[PDB]
Amino acid sequence: AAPTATVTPSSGLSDGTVVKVAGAGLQAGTAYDVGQCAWVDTGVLACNPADFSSVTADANGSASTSLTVRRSFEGFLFDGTRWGTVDCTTAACQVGLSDAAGNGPEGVAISFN
């Protein structure tokens, strides 16, 4: 099956809340980074590297880890440029997993309202 991710809880969040991130259909035995990002332009994500986590998929291609989410954060682009402050109540924030090459399941939308 194609890779998928789930984030629990995904709504009613507060700054500093810890969520469970699970992935399935991942590459067995591979390291994945887990993080919170927001789409700031067509095909451009601004992320919060200060709270990224990582996990290694098991022999069945499954993984489960915890992530501390932030209501707002200083966003950074892939090239390391500081983008500015991202507010998840007025920007579409998501949590996702990706391998060393940036591949993985689609991200999951979260809400802090």
| 3-state SS, one letter per residue, for the chain | CCCEEEEECCCCCCCCCEEEEEEECCCCCCEEEEEEEEEEECCEEEECHHHCEEEECCCCCCEEEEEECCCEEEEECCCCCEEEEEECCCCCEEEEEECCCCCCCCCEECCCC
Contacts of 106 (CB under 8 A, 6+ apart): 4, 5, 96
Tokens of 53: 């986590």
Question: What fold is seen in the domain 1-113?
Answer: Immunoglobulin-like (2.60.40)
Which residue is listed with tokens 């399935």? Answer: 24
Contact 83, 73 (CB under 8 A): no
Method used to obtain the model: X-ray
PDB resolution in Å: 1.5
Query: Do the bridges between strand 72-76 and strand 4-8 make them parallel or antiparallel, or are there none, so unpaired?
Result: unpaired
